[PDB]
């Protein structure tokens, strides 16, 4: 059995058809779809505190399911007293089935558990179908336990879509039921 995420089932069985009708696309897979979700977290303070970076990496692992990579400093800078090549950030890429499952978990479970959650700004679009927005308190995810955290942390989420514009991606996200603050 090729086990399939419920999001993938929902997409393939409805969303393709509604978007074809709604945007008069000539051929079927002109329809937008999702290629990757990038979860990033920038801990510049890790240059003092290694525990911060280790905790962030581990907590990302529990949140998603796959291990993270610690990015390095592209340039040595003094304003943040950064030496080139130091560990400064940590990111995870989600693709395919894991991507769909994570996005489902997020939208239905973790966005609800945010303090004063009143939707998400439906305008954080880079003009090319890529939607990036932040979450300040990782504790919204029930996966991580409260006691073991060493410092409350946030993280940025970027969703990359095959769409050529923002309208297409916003329509796809709305069909997915993404709680945009509107």
């Amino acid at each position: 059995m090729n086990y399939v995420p419920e999001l993938k089932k929902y997409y393939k069985d409805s969303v393709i058809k509604e978007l074809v009708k709604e945007f008069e696309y000539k051929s079927i897979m002109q329809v937008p779809k999702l290629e990757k979700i990038v979860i990033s977290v920038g801990v510049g303070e890790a240059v003092r505190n290694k525990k911060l970076l280790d905790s962030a990496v581990l907590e990302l692992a529990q949140i998603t399911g796959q291990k993270a990579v610690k990015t390095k400093a592209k340039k040595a800078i003094a304003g943040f007293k950064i030496r080139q090549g130091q560990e400064i950030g940590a990111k995870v890429t989600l693709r395919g089935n894991a991507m769909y499952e994570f996005l489902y978990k997020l939208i239905h479970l973790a966005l609800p558990r945010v303090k004063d959650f009143r939707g998400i700004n439906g305008d954080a679009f880079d003009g090319n179908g890529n939607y990036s927005f932040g979450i300040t308190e990782q504790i919204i995810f029930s996966e991580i336990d409260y006691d073991k955290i060493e410092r409350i942390s946030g993280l940025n989420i970027t969703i990359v879509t095959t769409a050529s514009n923002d309208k297409e991606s916003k329509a796809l996200l709305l069909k997915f039921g993404m709680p945009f603050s509107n």
């Binding site: 529990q62 499952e101 489902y104 978990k105 239905h108 479970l109 609800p112 959650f117």
Partner: protein, 58 residues
């Protein structure tokens, strides 16, 4: 891939206590309790107090 650096992903059923909706979602969280999903499949059941359709926003 190589296989030694990943937490154990598991299929999990999340149950809303309020609306009763259940979500099938592959969570790394091991739940002590087991539930028979609609599909006759056993899944670790985690009960979550707040979910999608029971938004104070939707």
């Amino acid at each position: 891939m190589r296989k030694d650096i990943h937490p154990k992903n598991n299929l999990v059923v999340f149950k809303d206590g309020s609306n009763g909706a259940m979500f099938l979602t592959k969570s790394t969280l091991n739940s002590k309790e087991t539930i028979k999903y609609i599909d006759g499949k056993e899944y670790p059941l985690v009960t979550v107090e707040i979910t999608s359709k029971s938004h104070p926003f939707y």
